[PDB]
Each structure stands twice: as C-alpha cells, then as structure tokens.
Design a protein around this ligand. Structure first.
Ligand SMILES: *[C@@H]1O[C@H](CO)[C@@H](O[C@@H]2O[C@H](CO)[C@@H](O)[C@H](O)[C@H]2NC(C)=O)[C@H](O)[C@H]1NC(C)=O
Ligand SMILES: *[C@@H]1O[C@H](CO)[C@@H](O[C@@H]2O[C@H](CO)[C@@H](O)[C@H](O)[C@H]2NC(C)=O)[C@H](O)[C@H]1NC(C)=O
Ligand SMILES: *[C@@H]1O[C@H](CO)[C@@H](O[C@@H]2O[C@H](CO)[C@@H](O)[C@H](O)[C@H]2NC(C)=O)[C@H](O)[C@H]1NC(C)=O
Ligand SMILES: *[C@@H]1O[C@H](CO)[C@@H](O[C@@H]2O[C@H](CO)[C@@H](O)[C@H](O)[C@H]2NC(C)=O)[C@H](O)[C@H]1NC(C)=O
Ligand SMILES: *[C@@H]1O[C@H](CO)[C@@H](O[C@@H]2O[C@H](CO)[C@@H](O)[C@H](O)[C@H]2NC(C)=O)[C@H](O)[C@H]1NC(C)=O
Ligand SMILES: *[C@@H]1O[C@H](CO)[C@@H](O[C@@H]2O[C@H](CO)[C@@H](O)[C@H](O)[C@H]2NC(C)=O)[C@H](O)[C@H]1NC(C)=O
Ligand SMILES: *[C@@H]1O[C@H](CO)[C@@H](O[C@@H]2O[C@H](CO)[C@@H](O)[C@H](O)[C@H]2NC(C)=O)[C@H](O)[C@H]1NC(C)=O
Ligand SMILES: *[C@@H]1O[C@H](CO)[C@@H](O[C@@H]2O[C@H](CO)[C@@H](O)[C@H](O)[C@H]2NC(C)=O)[C@H](O)[C@H]1NC(C)=O
Ligand SMILES: *[C@@H]1O[C@H](CO)[C@@H](O)[C@H](O)[C@H]1NC(C)=O
Ligand SMILES: *[C@@H]1O[C@H](CO)[C@@H](O)[C@H](O)[C@H]1NC(C)=O
Ligand SMILES: *[C@@H]1O[C@H](CO)[C@@H](O)[C@H](O)[C@H]1NC(C)=O
Ligand SMILES: *[C@@H]1O[C@H](CO)[C@@H](O)[C@H](O)[C@H]1NC(C)=O
Lengths: 415, 121, 187
C-alpha cells in the first residue's frame, strides 16, 4: 500500500518546568513573638536549621530549572521586518510589538487561561513567597529569540554561528531528512502553506474555547497552594494542651506549670512542619524530573530534526516552536502524515537476462499491466532503468522474483 | 518584603526594588551579565572608588541575521573543539548501630527501648 | 556531623548525658527522662535516614544518565543535538574521578562563512534539475553545486542532478546550462 497525498498537522504539548518558591520561619511559625517558647525550642537541638536549609535548597533549584530550559542561545536573534517566508504565516506565534509586554497571541491566550485573602493570612504567619529570578517579560524574550533563530537559519544556529537560508529550502532539507525527495516540496509548495496556516488557526480556537488542556500545568499550582492550607490549619489545634493560643497559656499560667503545655504544643507544631518539608522535598524531585525532560525536548526537537519515533509528536517530525506559559513551556510540533492510499502488487527483484536487478532506493510496484519503481513514502512512478537499479547475482535464489525488462538508457544514444 | 521609614537605619543611596529594599548599592543605567542574583531581573556586582552597584541584567548581545529569500551562507573552514562534562555516579556507603547511637553502653536503656517495635531494624 | 551534634542536646531532659541522669536519680523518676531522650534521638535518626533515602534517588537519576552517555557517546556516534557536546559530535573519551566520571567530547564547528546567491533548481530545456545531494550557489556570474557543510564548488553535470517535470511550478527557478558529460566523449 502506497500513499498519494500527505497532510501537515500541528499539535501542542504542555510541560511544567518550575513551581513557586516559599520559605517558612521555624521559630516564628512555632513560637510567634514569645521568648519562653524560643528558649524551649533552643532546648531542642538543631531542628529548625535543617528545615530552613532544605526550603532554601528547593528554592535555589527552582531557579536553575528555568535557566536550563530556556537559556540555550548565547545571542538574541531578531526577525527581519520584511516577512517573506514563501507563504507561511507566522504572525500568530511571533511577538506583537503593540502591547508593552512583548508576547504573542497564543502566549496571551495561555496566560489568560491559567488562574494563579488566602495570601495575607499566610503572610502574617511567618510564611513568604520569594519572587522568580527571571521575570516573565524576559522569558518571553528567550522564547522569541529561539523562534526567530529557527525560522531564518535552521538547525545551524545551535551548532556554532547562525547561517541564513531561505525557508523554502529549509523545508526541502527537512523533507529530505524523513525520506521524501526535494521536488515533492516545490511542486506542491502552494498547497503546504495553506495546510500549515489552517493547522495553526485551529490551535488558538482550541485554546479560547471551553477546553481543559492546561490541566497538567494547573495541577501543580493547585497542589502547592493546597499544602499551605493544611500547614496553616495544623496551627489551630490543641495537641493535648488546654488551648491552641500560646498567649492565653502564658497569660493564665505561671512558668513552672505553663512549661509542660508549651512543650506539648511545640512537639506537635514541629512535626506538622516536618511533614510539609518532606512533601515539598518529594515534589521538588518530581518537578526537576519533568524540567530535565523539557530541556532535552527543547534542545532536540526545536534545535534540530528528531528521528526518535513518537518523541516530538505523532507522525514524522519536521520542526517545533516553543511558547511560554505560567510555570511551564508549551511546544507546537509540526508533523507529516500520509493521507490517501492505494494497493499495488510488488516483487523483490527483476530478472532481465538471468541477472537479478534490485532497486537502488525505492520499491517495485505495478498497476496491473506495467512495472515501475517508486519511493517508499510517496507515489511517483518511474521507468525501470540501469541507472536506477543495481545487479547482484542471478535470478535463481530470490524467492519471489518476476519477469520484466530494463530500459538501459545508454544504448539508444549511440544509435 | 519591605516597601521603601519602616527600616530602622537609613543611609546613602537607598534603592527600592521589586525584590525588596536595597541599602548601600548605587543604581546604574547600564546592563551587564548577571553576577550576584537578587530577584525580579536585578543583579548586583562590585566594580569601579570601588563600589557595589545593582542593575537589570542583560540577556545578551542582539544581532539580526541578514535573511533574504535568495541568499545563503556557506562555511569554508572548520574547527575541532574538545569540551568536558562531569557526572556524579555514586556516594559514600554509611551504616549506623541503632542501639549504640541512642543508648550506647547502658543496659537499662536497651530494656526501655525494646518497647518500640521495629524502628531500629 | 549534625547526626553527632544531636547527641549534645537535652531534648527537655535534665542532662544530655545518659549516665549522669541515672547517677543522681531514683529509677521511677529517671525513667521519664530516659524515655524523653530516647524519642528525641530516635527522631533525630529518622530524619537522617529519610534525607539519605531522598539523596540516593537524586544520585541514581544522574547515574543512569551517565550510563546512557557512556553507551551512546563513547561506544558509537550520536546525533541527538547538544547531547554529547556543543556542535556536531565525533567521539568521546571517558576518565574516572572520585565518585564520578568525566567525559571529553570532541566536536566539529564551522568557522568562516561566506554569502552566496542561491536558487532552488535549474531548468535546461524545459526540464527542472534538482541537486542530488547539495545546494546550488553562485558568486554572481556562474552557478555551482556544493555540499552543505563545506564550500567545495563543483560544475553542474547530468550525473550530478536529477530531473522532475518542467520549470513552471517551481517558484524561484533560474536559467543555466548543464554539462551533459557523455556528449563530448561521444565525439
Ligand atoms: C492532494 O492534496 C490535496 C489533499 O487534501 C488535494 O487538494 C484538494 O482537492 C480537493 C478535491 O478536488 C479540492 O476541492 C481542494 O480545493 C484541494 N485543495 C485543498 C487545499 O483542499 C489534492 O487533490 C490531492 N491530490 C490527489 C491526486 O488526490
Ligand atoms: C496571516 O494571518 C493574519 C491573522 O489572521 C492575517 O491578518 C489579517 O489580515 C486581514 C486583512 O486586512 C485583517 O482583516 C485581519 O484583521 C488580520 N488578522 C488579525 C488577527 O489582525 C494576515 O493577513 C495573514 N497573512 C499574512 C501574509 O500576514
Ligand atoms: C497502468 O499504467 C500504465 C502507464 O504506463 C497505463 O498504460 C498507459 O495507457 C494509456 C492509455 O491509452 C496509454 O496512452 C499509455 O501509452 C500507456 N502507457 C504505456 C504503454 O507505457 C495502463 O493503462 C495502466 N493500467 C490500468 C489498468 O490503469
Ligand atoms: C522469466 O524469464 C526466464 C528467462 O527467459 C524464464 O526462464 C526460462 O523459461 C523458459 C520458458 O519455457 C523455459 O523453457 C526455460 O527452461 C527457462 N530457463 C532458462 C531459459 O534458463 C522464466 O520462465 C521466466 N518466468 C516466467 C515465464 O514466469
Ligand atoms: C510605599 O509606601 C509609600 C507610602 O504611601 C508610597 O508612597 C506614596 O506614593 C504615592 C504615589 O506616588 C504618593 O502619592 C504618596 O504621596 C506616597 N506617600 C508617601 C508617604 O510618600 C509608595 O508608593 C509605596 N511603594 C510601593 C512599591 O508600594
Ligand atoms: C582554516 O583555519 C586555520 C586556522 O588555524 C588556518 O590555518 C592557519 O593558517 C595560517 C596561515 O597559513 C597559519 O599561520 C596558522 O598557523 C594556521 N593554523 C594552524 C592551527 O595551523 C587555515 O589556513 C584555514 N583554512 C584555509 C583554507 O585557509
Ligand atoms: C566566479 O567563479 C568563477 C570560477 O572560478 C570565475 O571564473 C574564472 O575567473 C578566472 C579569473 O577571471 C579565470 O581565469 C577562469 O578561467 C574563470 N573560470 C570560468 C569557468 O569562468 C569568476 O571570475 C568568478 N566571479 C568573480 C566575480 O570573481
Ligand atoms: C529562462 O529562459 C526561458 C527560455 O529562454 C525564458 O523564457 C523566455 O522569456 C521571454 C520573455 O518574455 C519570452 O519572450 C520567450 O518567448 C521565452 N521563451 C524562450 C526564449 O524560449 C525565461 O524568461 C527565462 N527566465 C529568466 C531569465 O528568469
Ligand atoms: C486493498 O485490497 C483489499 C482487498 O479487499 C482492501 O480490503 C483494501 O482496502 C485495499 N487497500 C486500499 C488502500 O484500498
Ligand atoms: C537613567 O536614565 C533615566 C532616564 O531614562 C534618568 O532619569 C536617570 O537619572 C538615569 N540614571 C543615572 C544614574 O544617570
Ligand atoms: C553577508 O551579507 C550581510 C548583509 O549585507 C553582511 O552584513 C555580512 O557582513 C555579509 N557577510 C560577510 C562575511 O561579510
Ligand atoms: C524574493 O523577494 C522579492 C521581493 O522582495 C522578489 O522580487 C523576488 O522575486 C523573490 N525571489 C525569487 C527567487 O522569486
């Protein structure tokens, strides 16, 4: 079965890269503004320092993930003002200079879909949120530089110095990689652009509609903002004391008796903090395991052409485009899928004069009356010649060899 | 997390940033590569009398590829480079004695610890 | 070190030394002090065990990547970009370091680039010729076909290109002549 048409298709892929950086104060959360609790917590050995160190290691790692993902170009390439890409319309993904935050249309859709006082109560309880090192307006510049370097220089900008090349020949070189000759592009170019633009157009309509696609990027936000609620609820508990407010205990009891109640309260608040620290330490490893995969995919699918099956999308890979989303990266993979099929009767070889002729690069087929040789991933029949097949052995050992003739183009010229 | 006053002691060249309040660092208008990160795209560095300054970090040099629809760029010469890459493979192997670490040489401590089921093992 | 430092902490007991409590206290009063020290030290040991369990997986995630790099970069030639070093990959060498491995990657980078005026195809007599493997280039007057990653100009011949259709659909095709090497030798 040989395909006749093809089809270009664009599909999205979501990947979280980092989470929010938080830091709780052990002494402030456990005690508050009292000194007796401070002395007792000092009687406990070093439990607060380890927690403060772990919750700082996590926050440092969160700023290395984002650097490793996006910051892969050592220049900031800029697209030329004159847009002549042979018919491909990149306006939806290239930056819009109008709005002050230089982000494209799809990036704005993605930003509006995700939804990031609950914060104030946590803030007034020893909790805080450190800001990210790279502001989003600066990540939307790394992604723009990457996308502008991809569409004007190919895979060369990631392996040295960027070398320009027309986009049509870049598509020809990307077809030639997956097993389709160059002339399939040029003789159908006007078609392919019309198949690309539409493919992009259905993406934004799939984002502005009522669909749940950013769920994998919303789940981490929900989980991280949910753990804090339990961490704060655990502060409003008796744990065996008379009351959950340290001020009341210090107000209606002398030190030598209030000491045991304060101890009962500390031995529960410290454990409620330790559980949260451990949960965060596990989530950090999960998020880093995702961030490294994101970096690998960014470096292989975007900055080159992949040959690993089902890595950069379903089908055969042509290219990809990156976009930034809150705490994540969104890839747009462009692929190539055969469309219309036809049956044929094939043979492994052709016995001409007792010699077995094998195809050089292609496959023998027949429409029931005559035999041709064609490429594997498209239907383009050609005459069988000696400049198109190579001889090997004799037509006695091949299982299913058939009978036919070979053109031998050299002979008629001498005539 | 202090808006800039609410700070106890002031001084010279008080700077307000998106990451907090910066005291003791002059503000410049240039932009270099990040040396000491602060937050919200602010980095500080020590340079030339000598002073500590804080700026908005620069992503890198900006160039535009001379892209035209009938123009190509072919290399003519190459270079063989060699890089290095370090990877950890393993860490040290440790082991503890649960009885010795908690109690040590005492014998009544072992009898008292035996109540806890199987934590040591 | 921290696991040892936790020994020098009262945890609420009278004295952090186990013997000194029992030296100057009767059994059924010192029992609670010893029971407090026991649980304090037990929690201090559980914390260390958990931290080691997390760090072991953190290290194994890198050990597997090192095994993969040794299999692919060293025992063969890779094509995944930026995997075995910046640039096109040629070969790597391993070295051993305390608790780790050091890869020396040898890579190939183009150096000196020149501008050229190009063309998708050449059509000779109503037949469109496409390059078999290479790109058509020119220095402003004459046309050549070269390989992509190194400038080696070479004359266009019939056994250097291949024909497919007429030059009516190709967008930016330009006229030139094709050598046809058989004819002069036929003379
Ligand atoms: C291969 O390319 C496309 C496959 O979709 C076909 O082009 C369309 O054909 C239909 C049928 O006549 C027309 O109505 C459309 O206007 C064509 N263009 C588009 C963009 O849909 C083309 O016919 C296919 N070739 C063969 C031989 O089937
Ligand atoms: C590429 O796509 C854009 C977006 O669809 C096209 O821009 C439209 O152009 C028409 C013509 O005046 C306007 O009425 C629309 O408002 C434009 N769209 C938007 C979103 O502003 C554009 O024509 C397409 N082609 C090229 C070559 O850019
Ligand atoms: C199979 O394809 C061949 C293509 O060669 C068809 O043969 C052609 O038939 C037309 C019809 O008159 C002739 O004008 C051509 O000269 C034939 N080509 C030759 C002889 O090379 C053949 O008809 C096809 N068979 C079927 C069943 O469709
Ligand atoms: C394919 O061609 C070969 C060579 O012409 C055929 O082999 C001969 O076929 C004749 C036909 O009767 C026999 O008498 C000979 O004994 C065969 N072998 C020789 C000449 O060495 C072969 O039969 C053809 N395949 C077919 C017809 O299916
Ligand atoms: C920090 O707090 C001060 C105090 O309100 C803010 O300063 C005010 O800024 C507005 C806007 O220009 C002025 O109209 C007021 O007169 C200012 N108040 C004073 C006392 O000077 C300042 O904006 C706050 N900073 C931030 C980042 O919120
Ligand atoms: C490619 O670059 C290398 C750079 O080393 C050139 O080799 C240098 O050539 C100059 C002039 O002859 C010598 O002075 C240097 O000593 C050479 N370098 C080395 C390392 O041997 C080489 O000539 C360039 N290629 C071409 C075709 O000029
Ligand atoms: C473009 O390259 C061609 C091929 O090298 C140059 O043509 C040669 O020019 C030299 C000096 O003028 C002559 O000695 C050769 O006989 C020419 N060869 C051919 C095949 O024509 C041409 O001069 C170059 N163009 C420019 C502007 O330098
Ligand atoms: C490439 O060559 C063909 C053939 O020489 C050119 O086609 C000629 O174009 C002129 C200009 O209108 C016509 O008057 C002739 O009738 C055409 N056919 C001939 C001369 O056989 C074509 O214009 C050329 N393309 C270029 C130079 O870009
Ligand atoms: C090939 O023939 C079989 C026989 O019925 C049929 O089922 C199949 O659909 C045909 N292939 C195509 C691509 O139509
Ligand atoms: C930086 O530039 C602004 C104007 O954009 C100016 O008001 C300010 O004084 C400059 N800072 C210095 C230190 O010159
Ligand atoms: C190639 O052309 C561009 C555009 O004029 C120019 O900036 C560049 O310097 C040229 N290349 C070389 C090697 O001079
Ligand atoms: C390249 O674009 C220009 C318009 O800027 C056009 O005149 C020219 O024909 C194009 N190149 C080719 C090969 O068609």
């Amino acid at each position: 079965a040989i395909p006749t048409n093809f089809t270009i298709s664009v599909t999205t892929e979501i990947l979280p890269v980092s989470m929010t950086k938080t830091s709780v104060d052990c002494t402030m959360y456990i005690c508050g503004d009292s000194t007796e609790c401070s002395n007792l917590l000092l009687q406990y050995g070093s439990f607060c320092t380890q927690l403060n160190r772990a919750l700082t290691g996590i926050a440092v790692e969160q700023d290395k993930n984002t650097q490793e993902v996006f910051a892969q170009v050592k220049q900031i390439y800029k697209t030329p003002p004159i847009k002549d890409f042979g018919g491909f319309n990149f306006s939806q993904i290239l930056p819009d200079p109008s709005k002050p935050s230089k982000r494209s249309f799809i990036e704005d859709l993605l930003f509006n879909k995700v939804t990031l006082d609950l914060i104030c109560a946590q803030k007034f309880n020893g909790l805080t949120v450190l800001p990210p090192l790279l502001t989003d307006e600066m990540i939307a510049q790394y992604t723009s530089a990457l996308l502008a370097g991809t569409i004007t220089s190919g895979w060369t900008f990631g392996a040295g110095a960027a070398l320009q090349i027309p986009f049509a020949m870049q598509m020809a070189y990307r077809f030639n990689g997956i097993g389709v000759t160059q002339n399939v592009l040029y003789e159908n170019q006007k078609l392919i652009a019309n198949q690309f633009n539409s493919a992009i157009g259905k993406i934004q309509d799939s984002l502005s509609s009522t669909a749940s696609a950013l769920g994998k990027l919303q789940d981490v936000v929900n989980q991280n903002a949910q753990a804090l609620n339990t961490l704060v609820k655990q502060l409003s508990s008796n744990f065996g004391a008379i009351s959950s407010v340290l001020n009341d205990i210090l107000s209606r009891l002398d030190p030598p008796e209030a000491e045991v109640q304060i101890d009962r309260l500390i031995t529960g608040r410290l454990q409620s903090l330790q559980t949260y620290v451990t949960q965060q330490l596990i989530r950090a490893a999960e998020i880093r395991a995702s961030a490294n995969l994101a970096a690998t995919k960014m470096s292989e699918c975007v900055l080159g052409q992949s040959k690993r099956v089902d890595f950069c999308g379903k089908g055969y890979h042509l290219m990809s485009f990156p976009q930034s989303a809150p705490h994540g990266v969104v890839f747009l993979h462009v692929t190539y899928v055969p469309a219309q099929e036809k049956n044929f009767t094939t043979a492994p070889a052709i016995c001409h004069d007792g010699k077995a002729h094998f195809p050089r690069e292609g496959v023998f087929v027949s429409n029931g009356t005559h035999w041709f040789v064609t490429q594997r991933n498209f239907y383009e029949p050609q005459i069988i010649t000696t400049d198109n097949t190579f001889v090997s052995g004799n037509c006695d050992v091949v299982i299913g060899i058939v009978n036919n003739t070979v053109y031998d183009p050299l002979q008629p010229e001498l005539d | 997390d202090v808006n800039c006053w609410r700070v106890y002691s002031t001084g010279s060249n008080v700077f307000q940033t998106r990451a907090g309040c910066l005291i003791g660092a002059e503000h410049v208008n240039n932009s270099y590569e990040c040396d000491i990160p602060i937050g919200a795209g602010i980095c500080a560095s020590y340079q030339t009398s000598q002073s500590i300054i804080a700026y908005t970090m620069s992503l890198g040099a900006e160039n535009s590829v001379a892209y035209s629809n009938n123009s190509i760029a072919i290399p003519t010469n190459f270079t063989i480079s060699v890089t290095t890459e370090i990877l950890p493979v393993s860490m040290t192997k440790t082991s503890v004695d649960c009885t010795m670490y908690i109690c040590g040489d005492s014998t009544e401590c072992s009898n008292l610890l035996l109540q806890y089921g199987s934590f040591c093992t």
